[PDB]
Amino acid sequence: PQITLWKRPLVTIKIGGQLKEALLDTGADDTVIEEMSLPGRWKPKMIGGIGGFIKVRQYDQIIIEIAGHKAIGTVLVGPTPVNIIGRNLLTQIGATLNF
Amino acid sequence: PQITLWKRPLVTIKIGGQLKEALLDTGADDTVIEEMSLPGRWKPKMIGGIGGFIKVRQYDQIIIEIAGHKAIGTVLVGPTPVNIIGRNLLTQIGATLNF
Ligand SMILES: [Cl-]
Ligand SMILES: [Cl-]
Ligand SMILES: [Cl-]
Ligand code: NA
């Protein structure tokens, strides 16, 4: 699809057997999801943006389906105000910014 | 251009006759720039990022060039970690997300 930017570019994702709404975010290096359980090992990480840092759990090799497109990569879980699909997964679905 | 997302989508902007680096950020409603001098009056705005809410100065109808494309619109000035070009100006330069 071609997604204009008049409104937030929100899509439905499937992660950990759950459907969520998430923002396609070219300004995020990695994908950050609100609190949920994921399988496997994790390690703590701090990520920073406007307003400072939050502590997240880093899960590697997690499958997401993003607007129908499967990808695998790292997912950070923690108290983000919005679910964010970052570049680590946007690349895998072939997303580009065009102008 | 067609910008892939393997690296951060950084571009050069020109604002107040000065070149700066900024990040094309589909996850930002608003364009937010680091402390600088802009003309005219400003209005207060609270924005919420990943780590919490910050105060910024809102300047309207500011001339800004983004990757060679001319825009005129709202610029927020405050303690952002990086200069971000949000959807208010991405729409002005005709940017879309494509996959
Ligand atoms: Cl990854
Ligand atoms: Cl590619
Ligand atoms: Cl504007
Ligand atoms: Na894992």
Beta carbons of B98 and A1 less than 8 Å apart: yes
Counting beta carbons within 10 angstroms of the beta carbon of residue B16, is it exposed (0 to 12), middle (13 to 18) or buried (19 or more)? middle
For this entry, resolution in Å reads 1.3
In whole angstroms, what is the distance from residue A53 CA to residue A32 CA?
Answer: 13
B44 at the A interface (CB within 8 A)? no
- Which ranges of B1-99 does DSSP label H, i.e. alpha helix? 87-90
Q: Which residue of B has its CA nearest to A4?
A: B96
Q: Which residues of A61-98 are buried (b: 16+ CB within 10 A; e: fewer)?
A: ebebebbeeebebbbbbbebebbbbbbbbbbbbebbbe
User: How far is residue B97 from each of residues A4, A8, A25, A26, B87, measured CA to CA in Å?
Assistant: 7, 11, 10, 9, 11
Of the partner residues B54, B79, B93, the one whose CB lies closest to the CB of residue A99: B93
Phi, psi of B31 (to 5 degrees): -85, 125
What contacts B31, CB < 8 A, 6 or more positions away?
Answer: B64, B73, B74, B75, B76, B84, B85, B86, B88, B89
The radius of gyration of chain A's CA atoms, rounded to the nearest angstrom, is 13
Residue B52, min C-alpha distance to chain A (Å): 4
A3 at the B interface (CB within 8 A)? yes
Q: Write the DSSP assignment of B73-95 as a string of letters.
A: EEEEES--SS-EE-HHHHTTTT-
Which ligand has the nearest atom to the CA of B60?
3
Element (H, E) at A54: strand A52-66
Q: How was this structure determined?
A: X-ray
A21 at the B interface (CB within 8 A)? no
Q: For residue B33, how far is its CA from the centre of ligand 3 (angstroms)?
A: 14
In whole angstroms, what is the distance from residue A58 CA to residue B12 CA?
Answer: 32
In whole angstroms, what is the distance from residue B33 CA to residue A50 CA?
Answer: 11
Q: Which residues of A are catalytic?
A: 25
Q: Which domain holds residue A82?
A: 1-99
In whole angstroms, what is the distance from residue B86 CA to residue A92 CA?
Answer: 23
Residue B94, min C-alpha distance to chain A (Å): 5
Domain count, chain B: 1
Residue B43, min C-alpha distance to chain A (Å): 19
What contacts A50, CB < 8 A, 6 or more positions away?
Answer: B32, B47, B48, B49, B50, B51, B52, B54, B79, B80, B81
User: How far is residue B61 from each of residues A40, A52, A59, B7, B64, measured CA to CA in Å?
Assistant: 50, 28, 43, 31, 9
In whole angstroms, what is the distance from residue A76 CA to residue A61 CA?
Answer: 11
User: How far is residue B75 from each of residues A30, A76, B39, B92, measured CA to CA in Å?
Assistant: 26, 30, 11, 13
B28 at the A interface (CB within 8 A)? yes
B11 at the A interface (CB within 8 A)? no
